[PDB]
């Protein structure tokens, strides 16, 4: 089942940063080859951040952005 | 950062045990991957020896089950290759890698080696 | 177990012509219609390096130099143009079936 829970994904950093992107899709902390996505941003989001947990691992929410 | 990095004896005389590490670095091994050990004879012919999960569970390669156990420590966040014996011709370089369960199982993550020679 | 045979077992190419090295597997590696075949770079003193995974996607950070396709048990990896740090030795590999198994490798020589 799919869990709403806040705290930080694993292998994973979120920075609160003006200089972050905008809110857009929910990406999962992992890409496609299973390479973690090491450090994440938002803009005005609070700690600890928005996750999902599903079936194949971590997702944040919408707020939160990949850094580079 | 995720990081596995080897380390062990470098050198083991025949019939001895083998037990080497690999400890892991910005992730926890009790989430997302499989721990896999591969390793690298001269002539450079790389050979897949097993994994342990995230969950515990472990899988070995035929030619090897009679004498390797792949073990891990949570508190460590360690996971480890043991060879009952070894023969000379275990001589190799002992890699230690990881892929990630929901996918393709690409092996994403290596650690940069350990040479392991066995001789008298 | 899944054997793969890898051609050629070395391959001398000059810079920015075309370099393709071919897997080809024992058996049939698709699995629900994706082909569990990986592509790595190794250098001399390093770990393999993961070049290709599911035999057609360039790993993030990849040159897009490189390239991959192929399915069920016939793969093919090409780097063109061929560039100087792209010496060295190329290996494939299945995750179809347990044991993971790899090719004999290809060593990618320079001409000059």
């Known amino acids: 089942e799919l869990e709403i829970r806040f705290e930080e994904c694993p292998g994973t950093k979120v920075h609160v940063e003006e200089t972050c992107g905008t809110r857009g899709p929910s990406l999962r902390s992992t890409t496609a080859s299973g390479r973690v996505i090491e450090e994440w941003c938002c803009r005005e989001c609070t700690m600890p951040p928005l996750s999902f947990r599903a079936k194949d691992g971590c997702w944040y929410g919408m707020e939160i952005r990949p850094r580079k | 950062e995720v990081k596995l990095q080897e380390s062990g004896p470098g050198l083991v005389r025949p019939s001895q045990s083998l037990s080497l590490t690999c400890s892991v670095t910005?992730?926890?091994?009790?989430?997302?991957?499989?721990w896999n050990w591969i390793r690298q004879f001269p002539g450079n012919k790389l050979e897949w020896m097993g994994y342990?999960?995230?969950?515990?569970?472990?899988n070995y390669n035929p030619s090897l089950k009679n004498r390797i156990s792949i073990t891990r420590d949570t508190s460590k966040n360690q996971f480890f290759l043991k060879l009952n014996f070894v023969t000379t011709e275990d001589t190799a370089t002992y890699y230690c890698?990881?892929?990630?369960?929901?996918?393709?199982?690409?092996?994403?993550?290596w650690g940069q080696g350990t040479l392991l020679t066995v001789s008298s | 177990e899944i054997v793969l045979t890898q051609s050629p077992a070395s391959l001398a190419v000059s810079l920015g012509q075309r370099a393709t090295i071919s897997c080809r597997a024992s058996?049939?590696?698709?699995?629900?219609?994706?082909?569990?075949m990986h592509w790595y770079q190794q250098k001399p003193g390093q770990p393999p390096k993961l070049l290709i995974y599911?035999?057609?996607n360039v790993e993030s950070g990849v040159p897009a130099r490189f390239s991959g396709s192929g399915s069920g048990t016939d793969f093919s990896l090409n780097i063109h143009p061929v560039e100087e740090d792209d010496i060295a030795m190329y290996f494939c590999?299945?995750?179809?079936?347990?044991?993971?198994?790899f090719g004999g490798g290809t060593k990618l020589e320079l001409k000059r």
């Open positions: 910005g992730y926890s091994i009790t989430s997302g991957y499989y």
């Open positions: 342990i999960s995230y969950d515990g569970r472990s």
């Open positions: 890698a990881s892929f990630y369960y929901y996918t393709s199982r690409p092996l994403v993550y």
């Open positions: 599911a035999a057609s």
């Open positions: 058996e049939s590696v698709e699995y629900s219609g994706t082909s569990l």
């Open positions: 590999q299945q995750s179809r079936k347990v044991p993971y198994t």
